[PDB]
Every structure is written in C-alpha cells, then in structure tokens.
Short mmCIF file of C-alpha atoms and ligand atoms in Angstrom, two decimals:
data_model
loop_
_atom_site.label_atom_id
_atom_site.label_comp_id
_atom_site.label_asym_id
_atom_site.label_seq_id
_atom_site.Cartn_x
_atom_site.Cartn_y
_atom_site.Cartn_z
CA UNK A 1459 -41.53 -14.64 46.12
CA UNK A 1460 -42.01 -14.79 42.56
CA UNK A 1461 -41.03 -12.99 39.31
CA UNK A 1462 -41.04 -13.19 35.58
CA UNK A 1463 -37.58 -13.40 34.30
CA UNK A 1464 -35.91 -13.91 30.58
CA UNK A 1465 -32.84 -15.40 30.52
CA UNK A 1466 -30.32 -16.32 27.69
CA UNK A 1467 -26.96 -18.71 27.38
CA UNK A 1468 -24.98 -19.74 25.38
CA UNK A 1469 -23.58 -22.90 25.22
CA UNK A 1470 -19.86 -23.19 23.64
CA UNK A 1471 -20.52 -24.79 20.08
CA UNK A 1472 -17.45 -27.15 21.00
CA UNK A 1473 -20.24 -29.51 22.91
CA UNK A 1474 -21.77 -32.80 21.38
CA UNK A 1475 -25.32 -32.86 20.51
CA UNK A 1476 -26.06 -35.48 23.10
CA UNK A 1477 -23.90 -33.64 25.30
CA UNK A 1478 -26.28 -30.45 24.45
CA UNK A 1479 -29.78 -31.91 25.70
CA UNK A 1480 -28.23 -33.44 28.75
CA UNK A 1481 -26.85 -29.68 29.61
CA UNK A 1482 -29.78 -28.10 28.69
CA UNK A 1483 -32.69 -30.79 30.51
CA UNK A 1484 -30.12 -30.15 33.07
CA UNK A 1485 -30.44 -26.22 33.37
CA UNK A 1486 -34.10 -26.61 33.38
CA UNK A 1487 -33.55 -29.03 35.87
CA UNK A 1488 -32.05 -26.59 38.14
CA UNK A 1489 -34.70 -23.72 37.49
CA UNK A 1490 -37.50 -26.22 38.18
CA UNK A 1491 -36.12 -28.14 41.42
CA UNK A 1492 -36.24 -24.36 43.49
CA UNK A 1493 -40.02 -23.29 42.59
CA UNK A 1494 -39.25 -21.77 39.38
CA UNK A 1495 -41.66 -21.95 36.44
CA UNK A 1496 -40.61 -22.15 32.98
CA UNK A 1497 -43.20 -21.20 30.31
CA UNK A 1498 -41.63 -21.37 26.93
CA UNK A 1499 -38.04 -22.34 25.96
CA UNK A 1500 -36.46 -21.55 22.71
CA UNK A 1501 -33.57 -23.22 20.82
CA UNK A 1502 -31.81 -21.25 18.33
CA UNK A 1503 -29.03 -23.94 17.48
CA UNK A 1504 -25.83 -22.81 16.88
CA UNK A 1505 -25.34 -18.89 15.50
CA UNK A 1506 -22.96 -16.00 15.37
CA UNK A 1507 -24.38 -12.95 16.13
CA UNK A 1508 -22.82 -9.69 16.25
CA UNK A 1509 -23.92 -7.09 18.50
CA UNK A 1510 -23.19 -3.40 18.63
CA UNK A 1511 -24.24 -1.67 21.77
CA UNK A 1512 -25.02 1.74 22.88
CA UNK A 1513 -25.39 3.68 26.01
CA UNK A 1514 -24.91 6.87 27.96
CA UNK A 1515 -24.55 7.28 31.43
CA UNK A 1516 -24.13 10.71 33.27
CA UNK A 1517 -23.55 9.75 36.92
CA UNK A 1518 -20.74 10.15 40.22
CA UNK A 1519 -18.27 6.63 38.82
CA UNK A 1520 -16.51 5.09 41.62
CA UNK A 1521 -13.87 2.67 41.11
CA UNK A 1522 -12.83 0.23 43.21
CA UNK A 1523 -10.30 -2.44 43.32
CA UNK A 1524 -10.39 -5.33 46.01
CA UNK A 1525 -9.54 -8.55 46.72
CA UNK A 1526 -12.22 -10.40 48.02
CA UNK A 1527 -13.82 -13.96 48.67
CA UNK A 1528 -17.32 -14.84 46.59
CA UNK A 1529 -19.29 -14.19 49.77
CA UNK A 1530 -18.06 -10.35 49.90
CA UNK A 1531 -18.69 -9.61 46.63
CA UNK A 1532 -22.66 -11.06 46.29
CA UNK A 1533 -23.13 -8.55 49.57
CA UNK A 1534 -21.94 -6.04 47.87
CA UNK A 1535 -23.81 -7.00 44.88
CA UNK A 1536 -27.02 -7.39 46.18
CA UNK A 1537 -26.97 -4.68 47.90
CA UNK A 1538 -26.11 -2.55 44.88
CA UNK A 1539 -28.94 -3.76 42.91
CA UNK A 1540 -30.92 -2.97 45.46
CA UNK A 1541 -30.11 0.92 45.89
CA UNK A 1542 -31.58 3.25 43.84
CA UNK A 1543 -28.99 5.67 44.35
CA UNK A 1544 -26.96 3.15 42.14
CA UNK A 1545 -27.80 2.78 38.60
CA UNK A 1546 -25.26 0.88 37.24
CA UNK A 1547 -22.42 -1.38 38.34
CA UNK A 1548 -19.89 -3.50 37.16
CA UNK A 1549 -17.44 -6.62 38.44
CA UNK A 1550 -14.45 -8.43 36.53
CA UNK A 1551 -12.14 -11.03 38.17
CA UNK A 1552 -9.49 -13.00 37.07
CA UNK A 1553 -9.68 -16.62 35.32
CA UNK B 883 -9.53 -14.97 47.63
CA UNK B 884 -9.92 -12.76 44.09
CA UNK B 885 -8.56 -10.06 42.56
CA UNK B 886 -11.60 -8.09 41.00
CA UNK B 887 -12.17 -4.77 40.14
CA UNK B 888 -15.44 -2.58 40.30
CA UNK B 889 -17.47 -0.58 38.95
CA UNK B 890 -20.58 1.47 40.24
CA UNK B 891 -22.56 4.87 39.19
CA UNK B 892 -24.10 6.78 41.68
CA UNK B 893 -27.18 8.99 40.34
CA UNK B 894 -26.03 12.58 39.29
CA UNK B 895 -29.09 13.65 41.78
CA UNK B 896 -27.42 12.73 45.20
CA UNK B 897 -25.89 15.24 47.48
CA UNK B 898 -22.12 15.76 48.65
CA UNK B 899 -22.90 13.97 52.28
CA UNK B 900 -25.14 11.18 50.84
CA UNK B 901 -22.88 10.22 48.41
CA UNK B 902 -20.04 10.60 50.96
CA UNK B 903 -21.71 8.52 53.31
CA UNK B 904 -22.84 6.18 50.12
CA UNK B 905 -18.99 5.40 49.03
CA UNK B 906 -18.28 4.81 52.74
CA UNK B 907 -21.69 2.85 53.48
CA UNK B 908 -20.04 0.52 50.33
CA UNK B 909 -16.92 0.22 51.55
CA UNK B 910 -17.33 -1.08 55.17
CA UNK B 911 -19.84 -3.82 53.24
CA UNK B 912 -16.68 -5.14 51.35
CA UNK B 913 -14.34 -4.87 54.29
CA UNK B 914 -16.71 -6.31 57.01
CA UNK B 915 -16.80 -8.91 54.56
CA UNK B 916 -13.40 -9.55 54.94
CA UNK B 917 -11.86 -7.83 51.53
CA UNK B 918 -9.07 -5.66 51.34
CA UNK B 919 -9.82 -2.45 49.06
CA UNK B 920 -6.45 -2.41 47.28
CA UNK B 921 -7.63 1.01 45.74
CA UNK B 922 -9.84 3.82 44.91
CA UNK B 923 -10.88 6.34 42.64
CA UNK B 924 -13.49 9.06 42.79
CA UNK B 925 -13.75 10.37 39.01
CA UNK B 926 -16.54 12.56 40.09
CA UNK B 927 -19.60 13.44 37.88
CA UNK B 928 -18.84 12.08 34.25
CA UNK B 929 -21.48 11.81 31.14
CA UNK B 930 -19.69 8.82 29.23
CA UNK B 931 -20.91 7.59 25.94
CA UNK B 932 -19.77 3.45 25.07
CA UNK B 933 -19.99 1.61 22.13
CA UNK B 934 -19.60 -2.32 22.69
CA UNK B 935 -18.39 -4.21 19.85
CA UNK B 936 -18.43 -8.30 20.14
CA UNK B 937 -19.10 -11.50 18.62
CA UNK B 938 -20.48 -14.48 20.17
CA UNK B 939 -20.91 -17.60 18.26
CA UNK B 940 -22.50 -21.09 19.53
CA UNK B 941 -25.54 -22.49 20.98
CA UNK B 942 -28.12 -19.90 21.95
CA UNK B 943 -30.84 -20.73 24.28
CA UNK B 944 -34.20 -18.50 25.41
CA UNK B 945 -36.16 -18.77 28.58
CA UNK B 946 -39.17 -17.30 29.82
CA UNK B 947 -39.71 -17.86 33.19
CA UNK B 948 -41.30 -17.20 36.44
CA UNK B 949 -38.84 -17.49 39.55
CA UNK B 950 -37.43 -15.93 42.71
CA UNK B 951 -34.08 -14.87 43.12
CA UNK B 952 -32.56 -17.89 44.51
CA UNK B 953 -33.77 -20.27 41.93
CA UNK B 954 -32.39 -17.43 39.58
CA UNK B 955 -29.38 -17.10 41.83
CA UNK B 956 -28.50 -20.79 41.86
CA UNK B 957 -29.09 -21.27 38.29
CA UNK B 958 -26.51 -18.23 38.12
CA UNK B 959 -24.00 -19.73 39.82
CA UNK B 960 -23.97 -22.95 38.22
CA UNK B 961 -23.48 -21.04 34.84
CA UNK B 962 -20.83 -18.90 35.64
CA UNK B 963 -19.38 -22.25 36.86
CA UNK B 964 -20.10 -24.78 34.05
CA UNK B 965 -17.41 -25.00 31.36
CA UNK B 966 -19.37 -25.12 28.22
CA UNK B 967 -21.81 -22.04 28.90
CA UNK B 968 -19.80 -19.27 27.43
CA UNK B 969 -22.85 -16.49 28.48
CA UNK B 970 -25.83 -16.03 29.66
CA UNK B 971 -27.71 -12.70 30.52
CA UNK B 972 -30.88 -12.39 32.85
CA UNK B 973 -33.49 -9.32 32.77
CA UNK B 974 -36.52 -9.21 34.92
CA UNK B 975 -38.89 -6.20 35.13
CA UNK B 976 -39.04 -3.81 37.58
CA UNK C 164 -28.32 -6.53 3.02
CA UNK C 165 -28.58 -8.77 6.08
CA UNK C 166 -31.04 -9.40 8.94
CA UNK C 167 -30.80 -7.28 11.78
CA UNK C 168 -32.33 -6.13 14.51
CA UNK C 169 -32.65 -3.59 16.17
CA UNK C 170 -33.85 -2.51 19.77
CA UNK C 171 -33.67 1.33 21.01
CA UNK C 172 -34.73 2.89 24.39
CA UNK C 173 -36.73 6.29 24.59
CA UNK C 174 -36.37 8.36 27.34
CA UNK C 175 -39.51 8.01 30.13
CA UNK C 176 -39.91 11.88 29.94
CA UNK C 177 -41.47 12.20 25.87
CA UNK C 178 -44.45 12.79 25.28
CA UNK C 179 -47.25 10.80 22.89
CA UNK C 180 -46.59 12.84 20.41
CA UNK C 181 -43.25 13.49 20.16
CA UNK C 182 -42.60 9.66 20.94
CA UNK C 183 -44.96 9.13 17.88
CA UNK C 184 -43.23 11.37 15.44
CA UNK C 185 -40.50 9.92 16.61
CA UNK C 186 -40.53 6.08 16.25
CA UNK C 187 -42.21 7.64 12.50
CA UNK C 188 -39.02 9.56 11.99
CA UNK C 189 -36.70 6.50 12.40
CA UNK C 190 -38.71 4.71 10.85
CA UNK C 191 -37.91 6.49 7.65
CA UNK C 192 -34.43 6.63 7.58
CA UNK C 193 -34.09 3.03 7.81
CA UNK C 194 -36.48 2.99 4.63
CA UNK C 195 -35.34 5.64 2.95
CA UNK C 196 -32.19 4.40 3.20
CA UNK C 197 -33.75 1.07 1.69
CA UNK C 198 -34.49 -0.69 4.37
CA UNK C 199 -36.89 -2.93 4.71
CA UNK C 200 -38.84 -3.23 8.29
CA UNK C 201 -39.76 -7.01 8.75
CA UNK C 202 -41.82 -6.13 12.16
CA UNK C 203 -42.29 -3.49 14.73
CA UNK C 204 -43.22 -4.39 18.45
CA UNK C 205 -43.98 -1.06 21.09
CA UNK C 206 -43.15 -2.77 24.59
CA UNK C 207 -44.42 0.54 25.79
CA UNK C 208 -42.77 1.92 28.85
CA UNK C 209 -40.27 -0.48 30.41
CA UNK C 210 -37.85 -0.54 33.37
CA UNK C 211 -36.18 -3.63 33.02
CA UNK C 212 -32.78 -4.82 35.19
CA UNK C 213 -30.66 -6.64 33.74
CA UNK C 214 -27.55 -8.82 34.59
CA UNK C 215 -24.50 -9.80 32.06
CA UNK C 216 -22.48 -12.72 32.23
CA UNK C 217 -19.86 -13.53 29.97
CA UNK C 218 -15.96 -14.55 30.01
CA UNK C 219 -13.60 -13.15 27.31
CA UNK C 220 -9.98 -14.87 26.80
CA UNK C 221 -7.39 -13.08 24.86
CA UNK C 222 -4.48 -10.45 24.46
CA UNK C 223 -6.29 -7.18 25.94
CA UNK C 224 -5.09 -4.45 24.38
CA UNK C 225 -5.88 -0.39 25.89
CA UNK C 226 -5.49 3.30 24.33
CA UNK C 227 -6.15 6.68 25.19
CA UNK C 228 -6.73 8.67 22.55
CA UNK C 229 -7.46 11.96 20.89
CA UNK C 230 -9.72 11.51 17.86
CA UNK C 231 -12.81 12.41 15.67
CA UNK C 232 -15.17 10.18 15.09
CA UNK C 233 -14.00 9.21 11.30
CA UNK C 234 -10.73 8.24 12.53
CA UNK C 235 -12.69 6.25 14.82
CA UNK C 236 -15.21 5.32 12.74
CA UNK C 237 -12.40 4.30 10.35
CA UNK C 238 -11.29 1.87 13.31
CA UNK C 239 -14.25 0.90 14.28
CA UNK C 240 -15.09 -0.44 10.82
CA UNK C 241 -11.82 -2.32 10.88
CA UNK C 242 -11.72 -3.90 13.96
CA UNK C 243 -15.52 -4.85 13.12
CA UNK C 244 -13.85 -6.76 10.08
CA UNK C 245 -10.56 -8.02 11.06
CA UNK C 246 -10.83 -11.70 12.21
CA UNK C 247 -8.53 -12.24 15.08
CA UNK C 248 -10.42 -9.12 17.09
CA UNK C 249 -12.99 -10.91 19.53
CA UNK C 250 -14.54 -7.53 20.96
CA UNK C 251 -14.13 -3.71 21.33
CA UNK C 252 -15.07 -0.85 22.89
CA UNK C 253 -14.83 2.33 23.13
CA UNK C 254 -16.11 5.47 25.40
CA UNK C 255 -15.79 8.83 24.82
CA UNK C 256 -16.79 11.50 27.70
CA UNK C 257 -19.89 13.86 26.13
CA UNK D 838 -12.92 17.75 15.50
CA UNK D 839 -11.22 16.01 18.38
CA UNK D 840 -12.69 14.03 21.31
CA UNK D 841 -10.84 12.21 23.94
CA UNK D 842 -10.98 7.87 23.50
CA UNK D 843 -10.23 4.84 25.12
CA UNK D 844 -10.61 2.44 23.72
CA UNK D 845 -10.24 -1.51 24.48
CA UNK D 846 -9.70 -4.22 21.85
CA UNK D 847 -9.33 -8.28 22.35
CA UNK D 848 -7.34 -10.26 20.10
CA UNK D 849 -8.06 -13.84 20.04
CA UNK D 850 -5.57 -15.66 21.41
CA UNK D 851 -4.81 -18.11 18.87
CA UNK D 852 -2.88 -15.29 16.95
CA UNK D 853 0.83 -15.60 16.93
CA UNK D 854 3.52 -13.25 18.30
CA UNK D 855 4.84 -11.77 15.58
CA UNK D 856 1.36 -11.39 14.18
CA UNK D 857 0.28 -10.07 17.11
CA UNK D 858 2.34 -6.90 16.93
CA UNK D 859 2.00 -6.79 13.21
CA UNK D 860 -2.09 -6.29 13.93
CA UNK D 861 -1.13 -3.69 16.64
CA UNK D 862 1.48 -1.74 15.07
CA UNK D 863 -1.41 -1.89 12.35
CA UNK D 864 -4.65 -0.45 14.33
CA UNK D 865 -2.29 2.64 15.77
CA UNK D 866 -1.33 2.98 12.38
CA UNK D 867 -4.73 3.23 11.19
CA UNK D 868 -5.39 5.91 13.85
CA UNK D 869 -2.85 7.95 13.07
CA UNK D 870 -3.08 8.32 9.30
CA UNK D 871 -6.65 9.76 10.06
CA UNK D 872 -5.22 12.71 12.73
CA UNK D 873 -5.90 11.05 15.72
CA UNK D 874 -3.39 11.44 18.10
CA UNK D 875 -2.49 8.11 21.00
CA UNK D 876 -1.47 9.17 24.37
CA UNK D 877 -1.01 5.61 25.62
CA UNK D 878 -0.98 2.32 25.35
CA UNK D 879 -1.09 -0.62 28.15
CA UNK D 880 -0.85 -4.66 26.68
CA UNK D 881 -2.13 -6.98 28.86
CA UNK D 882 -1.27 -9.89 27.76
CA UNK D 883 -3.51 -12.92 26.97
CA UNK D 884 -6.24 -13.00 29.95
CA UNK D 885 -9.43 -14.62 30.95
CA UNK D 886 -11.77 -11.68 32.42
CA UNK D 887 -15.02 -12.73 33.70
CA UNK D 888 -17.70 -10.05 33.42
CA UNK D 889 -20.46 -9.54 35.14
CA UNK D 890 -22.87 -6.24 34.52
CA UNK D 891 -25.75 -5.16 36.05
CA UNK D 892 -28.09 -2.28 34.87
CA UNK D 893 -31.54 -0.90 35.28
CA UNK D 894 -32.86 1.01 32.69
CA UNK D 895 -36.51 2.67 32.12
CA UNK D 896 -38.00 4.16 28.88
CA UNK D 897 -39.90 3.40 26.23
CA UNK D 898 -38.87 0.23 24.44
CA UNK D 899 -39.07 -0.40 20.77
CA UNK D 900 -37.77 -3.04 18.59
CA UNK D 901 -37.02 -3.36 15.06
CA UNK D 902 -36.90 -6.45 12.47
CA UNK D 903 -34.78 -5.12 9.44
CA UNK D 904 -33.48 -6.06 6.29
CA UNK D 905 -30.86 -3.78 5.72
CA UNK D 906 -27.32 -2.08 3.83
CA UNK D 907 -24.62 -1.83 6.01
CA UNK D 908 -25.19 1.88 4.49
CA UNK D 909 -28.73 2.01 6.48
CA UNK D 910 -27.73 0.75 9.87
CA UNK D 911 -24.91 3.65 10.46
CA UNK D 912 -27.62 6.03 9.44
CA UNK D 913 -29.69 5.12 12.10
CA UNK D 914 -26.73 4.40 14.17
CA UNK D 915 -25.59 7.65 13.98
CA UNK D 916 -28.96 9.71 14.29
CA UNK D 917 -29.83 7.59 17.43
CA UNK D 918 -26.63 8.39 19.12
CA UNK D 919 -26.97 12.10 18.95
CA UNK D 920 -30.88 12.62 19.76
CA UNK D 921 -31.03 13.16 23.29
CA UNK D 922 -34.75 11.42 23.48
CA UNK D 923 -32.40 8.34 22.78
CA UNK D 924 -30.79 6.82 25.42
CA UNK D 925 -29.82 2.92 24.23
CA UNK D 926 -30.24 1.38 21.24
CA UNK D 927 -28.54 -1.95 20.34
CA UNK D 928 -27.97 -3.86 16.78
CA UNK D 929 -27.29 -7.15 16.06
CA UNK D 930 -27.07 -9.14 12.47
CA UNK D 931 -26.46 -12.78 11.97
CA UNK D 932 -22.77 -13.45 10.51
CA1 CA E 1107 -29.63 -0.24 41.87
CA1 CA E 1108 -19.28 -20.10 32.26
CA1 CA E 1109 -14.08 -8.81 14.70
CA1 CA E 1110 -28.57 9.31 22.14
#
C-alpha cells in the first residue's frame, strides 16, 4: 500500500553537526530501504518554537491503566486508529 | 513489561450496548495480549476544552513523503528509540 | 511583534458563506488589532490523522482547581514566562 | 465567574529543591490572590513520560502567517475559543 505522509522530528540540539547528517541520511535511510518515497525534505536548523494548542472534545473518555509488553499495546493501538467509534486516544509510559 | 496509562474517546453518537460491548471488545485485546488492566474508569460523556502550553527547542526537520505503514511504522520505532530525537509527529490524510 | 503562525480548524458542517465571512471576520481582528498577515493558505476541507511523539523529563506538578479564566489567564501568562516551566496544560469541562 | 481546572505544569529538572518549592508555593500563590480556589495538589516528582497521541480530525483547514502584538494573538485566541464553528486552532512564534 501506499500513502502520502508529513512527518516532523526533532533532533536534541546537544548533537554535533557531523553527528546531525549522519542521523538524518540515516532516517532517510530507513524511510527509503521499506518502499517509501521521499519528495522534499526541509531543514530548519536549530529553533525554539513555542506552541499553544487548542481543542475540544465532547465524547464517552475511558481510562485505562495497564501494564503491558510493546506487542499489547501496538494491538491495541492499531486497532484504535482503526475504529471510527474512537476519535481520539492517548498512551504514556514510564522512562 | 510497562506501566502505561490510556486514554481513548468514544464518539458521543454510540449507544449504551455498543459502547458496552466497545470498552469490553478493548479490553480482552489488551488482556489476550497478555496485560494486566491494573484499573478503570468510565467518566461517561464529557465536553473538555485543553490548552497545551510547551516549548521545544533544537533541530527541526520536515518530510513529505509517500509510504505505507510499516515503512512509517519502522521509522517510528526507531525514533521513539534513538536518543537524540527528542519528537517527531506524523499526519497522513484520510 | 513577533512571527507567528497560526493554523485553525472549521467545523465540516459551515457553509460557503458563513465559512467566508468567517475566515473575513478573523481576519480583521488580527489586523485591527495591528496585525500584519504575511500569507493565507485555504487547505479546504481536511481530515487529517495524526500521531504525537514526544518525551518530557521533569518535576510534574497537578491541581484541581476552581477558577475564572483571569486567574487563569493570569497563570497562564506566567507560566508562559517563567523559565524553569517546560510545558502546561490545562482543561476545563464546557 | 468560576470554572472547574486541572491543570498540569513541568518544571525542568535542573531547578533546585529549595527553588523548587519556592516556584510552587509561588504559582498557588498566584492563583489564589486572583479568587481561585485549589482543591488539590499531587507532586510527582522528577519523571520521564513518553507521550504518544493520536487524533483524527476533519474540517476546514486554514493557516495564518502573522506579524503580530502579543495584544493581537489573545484576541484571536480568545474569539476562536468561544465560536462554536471553531474547533482547533494552534499558535506558535519563534523565541
Ligand atoms: Ca479511530
Ligand atoms: Ca526519542
Ligand atoms: Ca515556560
Ligand atoms: Ca471554539
């Protein structure tokens, strides 16, 4: 299958340039190696950007808490993204 | 084995049994995946408004691309892993 | 004055019109208020997923409160400003 | 007026103890000399909390390049959160 995604990282500003290309060819690197197709790549060096965000959501919230292996949670994560009984939904772990 | 917590929304449409049966259909996924549901809460029908407040500062970098999912979902995975990627964020259209 | 921008979302149920008189009615305020609009782009009608990604290290810190919104707004502003504050939020039920 | 909050705040961790409470002891201070009124309060201690989100959302998209007052943004910031035909709407500024 294929679709058109945007994606953006950041990249800790702690890293060397050199470091930086090797990370980034890297990254690319992965996208490319799986059938992916990259059509234009911007570079915004470093920045600090601020960001205010908001939202409303009206909608039955379930809560869960679980301890789980990474397997268990994709499953339940794909097949949340999936439904379209579920609009939203949210995962935090500890590190 | 993780400690995580989670969220989900379930459309204000659905009915009492299909959302019943949703919340169940949900949990047995987790559990048949062998995780322990430590606990739950129902909070019912809410309307909440959110305000995020943040600052990120470092490298930022912009792709446009055509992919599948695993290609996306690999790339994901090696992200969340490597050390010096604080974020990254992926939107694809519907 | 700094750069900024600025993205909004408009419900899928307006019409051409009132979408028009609407994207003309914020438009002013910014102005009015003496802004300046760089650029405008209409992505039309969008239903975009999206995924976030990040990790956040630091003393978490949680309230429940009882406010108005200047008291908040008040914080808000603060918080915005003080330096050793990574990130907020806050939610309020409508 | 009076609504009910929560609200969640992150102190970088390079802040020392005795600051630390100083800048808490502060913000519920702020809060309260303005009539607002703090049921509880839960301190977490320093933690690493991965994130991950996941949201689908459909409407008419615009976006805005601005030069603007801090004065202008809250403006539209607080016309946008009150019109129901308004659902998201997200700012960022370089800093
Ligand atoms: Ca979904
Ligand atoms: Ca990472
Ligand atoms: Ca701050
Ligand atoms: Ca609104």
């Amino acid at each position: 299958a294929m679709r058109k995604y945007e994606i953006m990282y950041i990249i800790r500003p702690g890293v060397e340039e050199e470091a930086q290309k090797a990370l980034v060819e890297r990254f690319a690197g992965v996208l490319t190696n799986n059938g992916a197709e990259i059509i234009n790549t911007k570079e915004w060096g470093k920045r600090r950007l601020a960001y205010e965000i908001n939202d409303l959501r009206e909608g039955f919230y379930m809560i869960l808490n679980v301890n789980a292996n990474a397997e268990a949670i994709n499953e339940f994560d794909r097949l949340a993204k999936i439904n379209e009984d579920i609009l939203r939904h949210i995962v935090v772990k500890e590190e």
